[PDB]
Structures are given as C-alpha cells and as structure tokens.
Design a protein around this ligand. Sequence first.
Ligand SMILES: [Mg+2]
Ligand SMILES: [Mg+2]
Ligand SMILES: [Mg+2]
Length: 95
Amino acid sequence: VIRVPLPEGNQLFGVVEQALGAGWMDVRCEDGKIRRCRIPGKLRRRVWIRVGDLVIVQPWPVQSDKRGDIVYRYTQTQVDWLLRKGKITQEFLTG
RNA sequence: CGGGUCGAGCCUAGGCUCCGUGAGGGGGGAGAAGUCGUAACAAGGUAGCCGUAGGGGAACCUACGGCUCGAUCACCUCCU
Ligand SMILES: [Mg+2]
Ligand SMILES: [Mg+2]
Ligand SMILES: [Mg+2]
C-alpha cells in the first residue's frame, strides 16, 4: 500500500495554534488539553513547521496535559490524503 | 516576731537584634525554528571612544571640551 507514520505505538497528532517560540510548540489536540512540544536533534535542519500545518508528534506519559515531540512533519502530498480515509476529519481544525 | 544585708526566679513598660511565611515590585544568569530594528567591526556606508547634561519603542541621537586605541588625497612643516 504505502509507508506513512500512522498512530502506531503511542503517537499523537499535532496542529498548533501559535508558537510561543524557543522550541516549545503549542498544539490544539483533540486529546482535551493544551499541549507543548519539543524537537529532537535530527529535524532542526531540513524542514519547516508553521501554524496551519498538521504533523504527527509523540508524547511522554507525564501528566497527559502538556506533552508532544516532533518525529515527522506532513507534506502537502499527505495532509489532505489523510482525509478521505477518515483517520482525521477536518472539523477539528477550524471548528 | 522584729532590724539589716546577699540574692536566683517571676511580672509590667520601654529601647536594639535574629528566624520561618510575603500581597506588590526590580534587576541578574542560562534556553534559543517567537518579534522589531541594524548600533559596532572596512572611511561598517554620519570615523570611533571618554566626561557632563537633555532626548527617544530598543539598539541609540544631539550640544560643549578632550584623546588616537582613526581611513583617503593635496599642500605645507620637522627630521633622518
Ligand atoms: Mg552598522
Ligand atoms: Mg557609523
Ligand atoms: Mg589633556
């Protein structure tokens, strides 16, 4: 079929509202809480993360409130390709 | 029982000091995929810096008197 990072293991999905900066990414997840993410040492070179962008993140189990870690960003090729299959519906990005 | 005298302890009021919490405030140090400019370094595009005073979102701008730890050309002056 295809190779995409689905929710496999303990991943999350991350769509930020506004970046406070300095690494911390502020995401409006549908988990319920306001979450704040940080970046590992491999992806601060080739890519670009902005508000209006959907990515997959990975949390740590602490406090289930403010978690997340960037492990993969989504391209203009797959962001809306993950729509018809309904793995995410876009009613949680503007309303 | 009376007389004198040594006395720790206790109370009240006044002068100083120590310590755990502290509404509100102020700078300091690490973090650098947040923001606004370009002040320094070449004559860094207005030469840079010291003292004192006024001004400005912020680096900073201006006035008077000093220094060279200032670049280029032309003419002098003083030497080797
Ligand atoms: Mg400058
Ligand atoms: Mg200048
Ligand atoms: Mg003098």
